[PDB]
Design a protein around this ligand. Structure first.
Ligand SMILES: CCCCCCCCCCCCCCCCCCCC(=O)O[C@H](COC(=O)CCCCCCCCCCCCCC)COP(=O)(O)OCCN
Ligand SMILES: CCCCCCCCCCCCCCCCCCCC(=O)O[C@H](COC(=O)CCCCCCCCCCCCCC)COP(=O)(O)OCCN
Ligand SMILES: [Cl-]
Ligand SMILES: [Cl-]
Ligand SMILES: [Mg+2]
Ligand SMILES: [Zn+2]
Ligand SMILES: [Zn+2]
Lengths: 304, 307
C-alpha cells in the first residue's frame, strides 16, 4: 500500500510545513523536506504505527537524557558535517592545514587562559600517568603564529570529563585549558593520559546502538580548538597511539594524520609533573587564512 | 558542493546502521539506514549548515525534555498520516462503511470507570462548561446493534485541560473520562460538560517550532472515543463540536466530514441528572468493522498514561 503521492498526503505536507506571523522561510523549507522524506520512508518501508510510536517514544527518552548531540556523533552525522566542510575547502583550495575532526559534545567555555604553557590536571588521578603535549602554531608558510589561542580538553582515567562526570569527582576545568601563544608560536599543555570514553550505559544513545549491534566506545583522545585573528578556527583532535579502538571509534572521528607518536621521557620533576617518567607528544598545528571564517560552527556549549 | 554519492559517505552510512559480537535488530538497522541516508541527502541537497544541524539537534533535546515528541507527531501531521495509511489498507481489503477513524492524540488515560448503558463523567465542578449529553447506538456493518461493546470517552474541561494532564492540578482522577458498556439494544449515553478546544503548552517545544513555521497550536473542541468489542476491530475516533471556528483548522489535522454531528439545545436537563434545565444534546452512532482472520490488523500499541 502506497499513499505518498496522493493529493491528501501532498496537501498535508504543505499545510504542516507552511504558515497559516509569516514564519521562517528556511525552517519551513527544511521541515517540508524532512517531513516529506519521513512520510515517504514510512510508505516505502511500510513502517507501522507501533514502530512510529516506538520511535516517537525514543525521541522523548533521547531528549530527556540530554543526548541528542551524542547520538549525532554516534550515527556519523557529526562526521558527515566534517566531510561536507572538507569538500568545501578542497573546492576552494583551503586545505593543507591540520585536518579537522569532530568537536564532540563535551566542550566547556571559560577555562583560564595562560601565556605559553598551562598545567591542566587539577584533580589527582592515580590511574593516569603524566602527559606533556607541545608544539607550534604555524601558518601555511611555516611561520609561527603569535597570539593564537590553543584550547585543550580530554577525559580522566575513568573516561569522564570535568563538568560531565557522574561521580562528581572533578573540579571545574579539570583537564581543560587554554594557551595563548607568544612570539615563537609555541604551546604546551601539562596534563595526564586520557582513557577512552564510553556512552552512558543506560542512556538513549547506547540503547539505539545496542539495537544496531554496535558499541558506544571511543579510543583515548584529546580535543583542540585553535583560534587566531586572521586565521580560520580549527577544531581537531588526536588519538593516543596504540589504542585498540583507534579504527573502531563509535563517532567515526579518527584520521591517519591525527595519531602522533608517543615517547617516554624522564625529568618530569623539572616540568612540575608528579613523576620522573612521563609520556610526551609533539603535535603541531598549521592554520589556514580567512577569506571571513566560512567554517566556524556555532552550537550550544556548556560554560561556567 | 555535493558529497552524498561519494564512497566515503556511503561507507559511513552502512557502518553507522549495521552491527560491528551482538548481531542487532535487522528491522531497526533497515529503518536507521533509510532515515539516516535520507537525512544525509537532504543536508547535501538543501546545503544545511552545521549551525542549522546543531540547532535541530538542540531542538530534539528540548522536545524530549518537554516530553512532547508525541504532541509534535500530531502537530506535524505524522499522526494523521498513519491514519491515511491505515485507511488505504482498509480500502484495499474492502473494510469500508465503518465510522471513520481519526487520531488518538497523546492524552488517553487507562483505568476510567466503566458503567452499563449510561455514565456521568463530569466529577469536578466547572462553571464555564454547560451540560452535554452524548448518546447513540453501536452497530455492525449489517446495521445490527452490538451488545457488550465498550465505548470509552475522554475530553477537556472549559480551560482546554484534561484530567491527569492539567498543569493547574484542578481536576481529580478520571474527570471527564469514562466508559459505557452497551446493553442488548447497543445504546450508550454519556452525561458530561461541553469541552473547549485544546492548545499546545505555550512554552513547549511543539509551540516553539509551530511559531517558527508561522502556525498556531490549537485544536477545535472535540471528544475522543475508543470502541472495543469482541469480534470487531478497535475503533479510535473523535467528533468535533459543531460550529467551532477552528473546526477545519486543527493543528493536528484530525477533522473529518463524517465526524461533526449536529448539536441541539434541549430542555428537561434536571430529569437527566444534569445541573441545568437547558443542555446540549448530540446523537452520535458508531459502526464497527469485523476482525478478519481473528486478528485486529490496525490496533495500535503506544505508551499511554494509567493510574
Ligand atoms: C530526511 C528525513 C529523515 C527523517 C528525519 C528524522 C530525524 C532524524 C533521524 C535520523 C536517522 C535515525 C533515526 C533513528 C530512530 C531510532 C528509533 C529507535 C526506537 C526503538 O528503540 O524502538 C524499539 C522497538 O523497535 C522498533 O520498533 C524498530 C525501530 C522503529 C523505529 C521507527 C522510527 C520512525 C520515525 C518516528 C520518529 C521520527 C524520527 C525519529 C528520529 C523500542 O521497543 P522496546 O520497548 O522493545 O525497547 C526499548 C525500551 N522501551
Ligand atoms: C517528534 C516526532 C514526530 C515528528 C518527527 C519528524 C522528524 C523529521 C520530520 C520533519 C521535522 C523536522 C524538525 C526539525 C527540528 C528543528 C527545527 C527547529 C529548530 C529551531 O528552532 O531552530 C531555530 C533556528 O533555525 C534554524 O537554524 C533552521 C534549521 C533547523 C533545522 C535543521 C534540522 C537538521 C536535522 C537535525 C535532526 C537530526 C539529528 C539527530 C539524528 C532556532 O534556533 P536558534 O537560532 O535559537 O539556535 C539555538 C541552537 N544553536
Ligand atoms: Cl454508577
Ligand atoms: Cl507552557
Ligand atoms: Mg452505512
Ligand atoms: Zn572526547
Ligand atoms: Zn483531545
Amino acid at each position: 500500500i502506497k499513499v505518498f503521492e496522493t493529493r491528501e498526503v501532498q496537501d498535508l505536507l504543505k499545510a504542516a510545513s507552511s504558515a497559516n506571523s509569516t514564519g521562517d522561510a528556511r525552517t519551513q523549507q527544511i521541515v517540508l523536506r524532512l517531513l516529506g522524506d519521513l512520510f515517504k520512508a514510512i510508505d516505502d518501508l511500510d513502517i507501522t504505527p507501533d514502530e512510529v510510536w516506538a520511535g516517537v517514544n525514543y525521541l522523548n527518552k533521547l531528549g530527556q537524557d540530554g543526548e541528542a548531540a551524542l547520538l549525532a556523533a554516534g550515527l556519523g552525522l557529526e562526521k558527515y558535517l566534517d566531510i561536507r566542510m572538507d569538500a568545501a575547502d578542497a573546492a576552494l583550495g583551503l586545505d593543507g592545514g591540520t585536518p579537522r575532526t569532530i568537536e564532540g559534545p563535551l566542550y566547556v567555555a571559560g577555562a583560564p587562559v595562560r601565556d605559553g604553557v598551562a598545567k591542566i590536571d587539577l584533580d589527582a588521578d592515580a590511574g593516569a600517568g603524566p602527559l606533556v603535549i607541545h608544539g607550534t602554531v604555524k601558518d601555511l608558510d611555516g611561520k609561527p603564529v603569535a597570539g593564537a589561542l590553543v584550547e585543550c580538553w580530554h577525559a580522566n582515567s575513568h573516561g569522564f570529563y570535568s563538568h560531565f562526570d557522574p561521580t562528581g569527582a572533578q573540579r571545574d576545568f579539570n583537564l581543560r585549558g587554554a594557551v595563548r601563544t607568544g612570539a615563537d608560536g609555541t604551546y604546551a599543555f601539562r596534563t595526564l593520559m586520557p582513557v577512552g570514553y564510553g556512552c552512558p550505559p543506560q542512556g538513549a544513545t547506547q540503547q539505539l546502538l545496542d539495537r544496531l549491534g554496535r558499541h558506544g566506545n571511543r579510543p583515548a583522545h584529546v580535543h583542540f580548538f585553535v583560534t587566531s585573528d586572521g586565521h580560520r578556527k580549527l577544531t581537531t583532535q588526536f588519538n593516543i597511539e596504540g589504542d585498540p579502538l583507534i579504527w573502531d571509534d563509535f563517532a567515526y572521528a579518527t584520521r591517519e594524520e591525527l595519531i602522533p607518536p608517543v615517547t617516554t621521557k624522564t625529568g618530569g620533576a623539572a616540568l612540575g609533573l608528579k613523576a620522573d617518567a612521563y609520556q610526551d607528544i609533539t603535535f603541531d598545528f598549521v592554520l589556514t587564512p580567512r577569506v571571513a571564517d566560512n567554517q566556524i560552527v556555532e552550537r550550544p556549549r556548556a560554560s561556567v
